[PDB]
């Protein structure tokens, strides 16, 4: 089972995935890690693990379509069974989403449908929500509109800073992402009729309950 | 629980609603029926049931805003708890949608998002669909774009005419519309964050599953 991970920054989720393959919780391997930022430390995590790395700078391309195309061309050298977005700060084109339909995953730092887009933690905290979390879902063209597979809620108390809750959510992300990937790896997770299905059963709008 | 129905034609769905209130499946009453067509037989259905009727002709108004305004003014004489569109062939203005936000329902003759608008049936046959149906949803300014509450699928077999399928879908409509209205009447159905919620639970893009 070949996994290709796409990142943009630190890559703590990438690390959790790497560790899960190592323990075999995930019966597969991370074949490659792609980044749109040359600096991303995640690349360094993959490097140290003997995993291949690649970098595609948006400037070197003259259109989003041209960029994803070279991305698809590159990612495919590894014959991935699933493409995983772990902190990938770049929106993917419909062509790309199409090419990996049903096998493209992402983990959004909020309790979807709440706060699609960037700056989740802040909004959650500035709006005064008593509950925050993360959501792993199948990627569709709609910015975080795809079928939610699993969420991990996290209590929000007075006094918690933006970083406090962020580190709290992160701890959950490291738990549910590798898990969702393992479900996928065992052919227990699929998507059709734009819905997410676990063990053959339809999952609710907010993921496995 | 006061219900105000808006129609344009025969009113078979109106009748199903009327019958459901009679049996108390819906714990409420159709207080009035409005139509934008003087001929609509639905008016006679209501008439025979001892229900009040009203007609508002578009020609008698010089703008859509003026028309809905008078519509709101009239509908409100009946202090409705919910306004139900049953075959109403007229697009309502934002102000109107706003005034009945969360308490305005419609039943579209197709499996939304597929075939928003008119000519559902014909497109289904034409586009060679193996499945057709109806969708009850909360009304928002987006033409059949609001939160779908419940759909009723219907199989399509070679040999089926546009009338064969239409009559098949109608039969379903008479079943799910009164049902959805009862959910609403029991305070079990609500809309917030532009989503449909049944028994406190968020419903999928396709309605209750
Ligand atoms: N088609 C598609 N659908 C999704 O749901 C995607 C989901 C993701 C991750 C997502 C996160 O979980 O939240 C996410 C959502 C939004 C942006 C963004 O706007 N980034 C750029 C803007 C556009 C770009 O440069 O790509 C910025 O600098 O603000 C970056 C990641 C990435 C690509 C996606 N692509
Ligand atoms: N604001 C609003 N939003 C919706 O979603 C509505 C949904 C409905 C029913 C709908 C059905 O599901 O099918 C529906 C779909 C299309 C037309 C239409 O084009 N009507 C006019 C156009 C303009 C007018 O009303 O004068 C015509 O003569 O084609 C009328 C109702 C009626 C009014 C609505 N109003
Ligand atoms: N564009 C994707 C996105 O929203 N990523 C989010 O940014 C953080 C980076 O974690 P990381 O250590 O896994 O890189 C994670 O919390 C992840 O959900
Ligand atoms: N614009 C509304 C609309 O498309 N309504 C649809 O027209 C038919 C009329 O039924 P009826 O008059 O016998 O209830 C119904 O099938 C309804 O879904």
Question: How is this structure best described in words?
Answer:
The structure is a homodimer of 209-residue chains. With 209 residues, the first copy, chain A, is of the alpha/beta class. Chain A contains six helices and ten strands. In chain A, helix 1 packs parallel to helix 6 (162-185). In chain A, 41% of the residues are buried. The interface between A and B is small, with 8 and 9 residues. The complex binds ligand NHR (2 copies) and glycinamide ribonucleotide (GAR) (2 copies). One glycinamide ribonucleotide is lined by residues 7, 9-14, 86-89, 107-109, 134, 170, 173 of chain A. It is classed as transferase. Keywords: purine biosynthesis, anti-cancer agent, inhibitor complex, transferase.
Major beta sheet, strand line-up of chain A: 3-2-1-4-5-6-7
Number of domains of chain A: 1
Specify the number of helices of chain A.
6
- Rg for CA atoms of chain A: 16 Å
Assign the structural class of chain A, choosing from mainly alpha, mainly beta, alpha/beta, alpha+beta, or little secondary structure: alpha/beta
End-to-end Cα distance of chain A: 27 Å
Summarize the structure.
Two copies of one chain form a homodimer. Chain A is an alpha/beta fold. Chain A contains six helices and ten strands.
List the helices and strands and how they pair.
Two copies of one chain form a homodimer.
Chain A: E1 2-7, H1 12-22, E2 29-35, H2 41-48, E3 52-55, H3 64-75, E4 82-85, H4 94-99, E5 104-108, H5 120-126, E6 131-138, E7 148-155, H6 162-185, E8 189-192, E9 195-198, E10 201-202
Parallel strand pairs in A: 1-2, 1-4, 2-3, 4-5
Antiparallel strand pairs in A: 5-6, 6-7, 8-9, 9-10
Bound molecules: ligand NHR (2 copies) and glycinamide ribonucleotide (2 copies).
PDB class: transferase
Keywords: purine biosynthesis, anti-cancer agent, inhibitor complex, transferase
Assembly: dimeric
